[PDB]
Amino acid sequence: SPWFGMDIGGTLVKLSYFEPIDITAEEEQEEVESLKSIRKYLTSNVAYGSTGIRDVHLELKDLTLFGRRGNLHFIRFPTQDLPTFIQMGRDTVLCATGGGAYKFEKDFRTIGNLHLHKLDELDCLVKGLLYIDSVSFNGQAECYYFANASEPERCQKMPFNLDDPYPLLVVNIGSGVSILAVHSKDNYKRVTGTSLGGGTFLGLCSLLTGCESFEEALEMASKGDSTQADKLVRDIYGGDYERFGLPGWAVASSFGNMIYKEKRESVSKEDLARATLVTITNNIGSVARMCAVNEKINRVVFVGNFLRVNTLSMKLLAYALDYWSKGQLKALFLEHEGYFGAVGALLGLPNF
Amino acid sequence: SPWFGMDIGGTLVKLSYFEPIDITAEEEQEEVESLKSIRKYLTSNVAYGSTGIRDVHLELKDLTLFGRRGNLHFIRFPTQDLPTFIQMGRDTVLCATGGGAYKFEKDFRTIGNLHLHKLDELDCLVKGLLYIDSVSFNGQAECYYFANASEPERCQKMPFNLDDPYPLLVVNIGSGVSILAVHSKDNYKRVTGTSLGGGTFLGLCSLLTGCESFEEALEMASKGDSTQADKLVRDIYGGDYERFGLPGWAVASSFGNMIYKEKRESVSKEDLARATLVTITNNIGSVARMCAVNEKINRVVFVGNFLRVNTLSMKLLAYALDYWSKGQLKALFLEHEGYFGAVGALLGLPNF
Numbered sequence: 192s193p194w195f196g197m198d199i200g201g202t203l204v205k206l207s208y209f210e211p212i213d214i215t216a217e218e219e220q221e222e223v224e225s226l227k228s229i230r231k232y233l234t235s236n237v238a239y240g241s242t243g244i245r246d247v248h249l250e251l252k253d254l255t256l257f258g259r260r261g262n263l264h265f266i267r268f269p270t271q272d273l274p275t276f277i278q279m280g281r282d283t284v285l286c287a288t289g290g291g292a293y294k295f296e297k298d299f300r301t302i303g304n305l306h307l308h309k310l311d312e313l314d315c316l317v318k319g320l321l322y323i324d325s326v327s328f329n330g331q332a333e334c335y336y337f338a339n340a341s342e343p344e345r346c347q348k349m350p351f352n353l354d355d356p357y358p359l360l361v362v363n364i365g366s367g368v369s370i371l372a373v374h375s376k377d378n379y380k381r382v383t384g385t386s387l388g389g390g391t392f393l394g395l396c397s398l399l400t401g402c403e404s405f406e407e408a409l410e411m412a413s414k415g416d417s418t419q420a421d422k423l424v425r426d427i428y429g430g431d432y433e434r435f436g437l438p439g440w441a442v443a444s445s446f447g448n449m450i451y452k453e454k455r456e457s458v459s460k461e462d463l464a465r466a467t468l469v470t471i472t473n474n475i476g477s478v479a480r481m482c483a484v485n486e487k488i489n490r491v492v493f494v495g496n497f498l499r500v501n502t503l504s505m506k507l508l509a510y511a512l513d514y515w516s517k518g519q520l521k522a523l524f525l526e527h528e529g530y531f532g533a534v535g536a537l538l539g540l541p542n543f
Numbered sequence: 544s545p546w547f548g549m550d551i552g553g554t555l556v557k558l559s560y561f562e563p564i565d566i567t568a569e570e571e572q573e574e575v576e577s578l579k580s581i582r583k584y585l586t587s588n589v590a591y592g593s594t595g596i597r598d599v600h601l602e603l604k605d606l607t608l609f610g611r612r613g614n615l616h617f618i619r620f621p622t623q624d625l626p627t628f629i630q631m632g633r634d635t636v637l638c639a640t641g642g643g644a645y646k647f648e649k650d651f652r653t654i655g656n657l658h659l660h661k662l663d664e665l666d667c668l669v670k671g672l673l674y675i676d677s678v679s680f681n682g683q684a685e686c687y688y689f690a691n692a693s694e695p696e697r698c699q700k701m702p703f704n705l706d707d708p709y710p711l712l713v714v715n716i717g718s719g720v721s722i723l724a725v726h727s728k729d730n731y732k733r734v735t736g737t738s739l740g741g742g743t744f745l746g747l748c749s750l751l752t753g754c755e756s757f758e759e760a761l762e763m764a765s766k767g768d769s770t771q772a773d774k775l776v777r778d779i780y781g782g783d784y785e786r787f788g789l790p791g792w793a794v795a796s797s798f799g800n801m802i803y804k805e806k807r808e809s810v811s812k813e814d815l816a817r818a819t820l821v822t823i824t825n826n827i828g829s830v831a832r833m834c835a836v837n838e839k840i841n842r843v844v845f846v847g848n849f850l851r852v853n854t855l856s857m858k859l860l861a862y863a864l865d866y867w868s869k870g871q872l873k874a875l876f877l878e879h880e881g882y883f884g885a886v887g888a889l890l891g892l893p894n895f
């Protein structure tokens with residue numbers, strides 16, 4: 192049985208795969224071809240079919256797990272393509288989490304004798320986050336922040352120590368947003384959530400610009416000016432409003448300049464992409480800040496795949512949390528941000 | 544000098560006008576034609592030019608104000624048309640609030656000898672809200688709620704007593720959203736705000752559907768199904784997720800089903816209008832709930848013109864605040880919700 196951990200989300204399936212590297216002579220002989228073909232197929236390819244991808248840069252090398260040494264691999268593909276994944280399987284114990292572990296339970300059971308063990312999303316994310324930080328990212332920090340996020344000539348990624356990680360506010364940006372308060376290794380709760388998440392960015396961006404992928408949406412946003420679509424404080428007051436500490440550059444109304452027909456006719460797709468990204472990211476930051484104040488937690492870590500190859504949103508979150516909290520809150524990021532549920536699922540394997 | 548109160552917002556100008564009804568014989572003789580022509584023009588018309596409207600149903604009759612009896616009138620027009628308003632004036636003491644009192648200060652001063660007194664938006668809104676509730680709406684309650692908002696066969700508008708209105712959370716939904724905590728008649732603060740407000744609804748709706756007015760956007764939304772665009776909890780799990788108390792009907796990702804090209808090709812403009820309305824309204828409710836919990840305030844009153852002729856959003860707010868707060872928070876509404884800043888400005892007249 193290959194060791195796999197699976198997180199079946201609304202948008203992406205994330206898979207963690209432990210590749211043993213201490214295979215003895217006797218162990219190699221006493222393994223079936225189907226297993227050897229799986230291990231070679233996964234380790235000799237970085238693209239699987241048309242839509243599967245191995246994130247090679249995230250691999251943890253020479254990890255000791257369950258008394259064996261091996262490499263931990265991180266693989267993703269669209270949930271829309273799970274039927275292809277299951278069909279390839281039909282031609283073992285699977286620990287699975289995410290909503291799809293429930294939605295697709297019956298489909299996994301079409302693989303003969305497969306034991307499906309559905310694991311709680313919250314337990315998986317927390318256990319996987321604590322585990323990866325504890326083993327380190329091949330000796331480097333798993334957690335980082337943007338130092339001096341207020342000044343762009345100084346703003347720089349820097350490591351952050353989570354050896355005592357409690358308490359922690361975890362903001363999981365997937366299709367929607369879930370916000371978790373973690374008080375200890377066995378004391379954590381879902382605080383609330385918001386439906387304005389990564390699927391809102393991608394869905395609205397696709398409607399507004401015709402982009403066909405997440406990466407294209409980000410590329411458009413990198414070229415745009417959100418202020419062509421948004422109504423700013425200075426658009427309403429003529430400048431700053433210091434009475435309530437609002438700088439003139441703050442957004443007063445997202446897409447608010449689009450009530451004017453002449454402005455809708457002049458706005459570019461790139462402007463609209465950037466306004467969508469800014470709108471969603473600022474709302475996530477603000478909800479995170481309000482939850483952190485209510486939970487009395489000053490460390491806010493962001494996870495999920497909305498922030499994958501998305502430095503714009505990461506820097507916007509770092510700047511916004513620091514600015515609007517007057518320096519009381521710190522935005523934290525993790526290298527394996529999309530995969531903690533899949534790792535936590537894999538870590539449940541000894542229980543079965 | 545006619546008695547006027549003006550709130551110049553990012554989208555609409557709101558005007559409160561006190562029409563004296565106790566004019567004596569000597570007072571009528573000793574009034575200039577320009578004044579008599581203004582009073583007759585305002586009281587004999589309900590539409591002013593192409594874009595001005597008198598909200599006749601809101602008129603307060605036989606009010607005693609500043610030692611005189613009169614009628615209080617409520618008038619609105621688009622801020623885009625303020626140049627026409629000022630040009631009509633060029634062919635007195637004006638108490639004005641809103642961002643436009645600052646932005647357009649120099650324009651008002653093109654009216655010879657006009658004294659412009661800019662008044663704080665927060666002071667104006669609070670004073671005007673407390674004043675209107677205190678004088679009543681022609682003997683009826685100014686404040687109401689939706690009783691039994693969970694069951695549609697029973698959900699009904701009912702009066703709410705604000706004789707002791709403190710503490711109160713005021714959610715001002717204009718172009719953006721401002722959230723105020725009111726602890727006493729002289730102790731109140733702006734808690735925070737969100738840029739996802741009425742201008743976001745109108746601007747995004749116009750981009751997505753081509754609607755040309757707020758009223759058309761609402762009419763489209765009344766015919767639509769937001770679930771064609773939104774990804775629900777049941778879309779991700781296959782049903783409810785009781786582990787975190789999430790019903791299957793809850794929105795997990797606003798516009799989240801629009802990441803699929805075939806769904807973007809089948810969605811109607813009415814569906815998109817309704818999803819925009821639901822997205823913006825739920826986000827406002829959630830931010831209001833989080834602020835109410837942090838401020839330890841259980842009465843949340845919604846004002847602004849986003850809710851004008853918008854019963855869908857009002858009922859959604861009433862249902863959502865009650866449901867997600869497990870009955871700890873009550874959504875409150877006010878008949879004069881768009882005009883409290885203009886009234887509060889008028890009430891500043893004795894200070895000048």
Ligand SMILES: Nc1ncnc2c1ncn2[C@@H]1O[C@H](COP(=O)(O)OP(=O)(O)NP(=O)(O)O)[C@@H](O)[C@H]1O
Nearest residue numbers: 200201202203365366367389390405495496497499
């Ligand atoms: N290759 C990609 N395809 C689609 N979306 C992507 C991709 N890369 C990054 N994203 C973004 O990542 C978000 C999904 O993040 P992810 O954490 O994998 O969520 P999910 O688990 O699949 N959904 P959920 O059920 O809400 O937990 C999408 O909404 C996009 O904004």
Ligand SMILES: Nc1ncnc2c1ncn2[C@@H]1O[C@H](COP(=O)(O)OP(=O)(O)NP(=O)(O)O)[C@@H](O)[C@H]1O
Nearest residue numbers: 552553554555717718719741742757847848849851
């Ligand atoms: N006739 C209308 N024209 C435009 N918008 C309308 C109209 N009626 C209702 N609305 C809605 O009301 C919102 C404006 O509300 P309002 O409270 O008057 O804000 P504002 O004061 O002009 N803006 P702000 O500067 O943010 O305080 C718009 O964003 C629309 O969603």
Ligand SMILES: CC(=O)Nc1ccc(CC(=O)N2CCN(c3ccc(Cl)nn3)CC2)cc1
Nearest residue numbers: 367368383384385386795828829863864867
């Ligand atoms: C995998 C998964 O489950 N994803 C998920 C599921 C749900 C959500 C949204 C959420 O958590 N919601 C909905 C909005 N809410 C409101 C709304 C109006 C008010 Cl007045 N108050 N709260 C709070 C509760 C986010 C992501």
Ligand SMILES: CC(=O)Nc1ccc(CC(=O)N2CCN(c3ccc(Cl)nn3)CC2)cc1
Nearest residue numbers: 443476477511512515719720735736737738
């Ligand atoms: C007439 C008027 O002034 N309208 C107005 C002005 C401003 C706003 C928005 C607002 O108040 N903002 C901006 C978002 N904010 C964030 C953002 C990211 C984080 Cl991390 N935290 N907070 C909080 C402060 C709303 C309406």
Ligand SMILES: [Mg+2]
Nearest residue numbers: 200201289365
């Ligand atoms: Mg997920």
Ligand SMILES: [Mg+2]
Nearest residue numbers: 552553641717
């Ligand atoms: Mg206003």
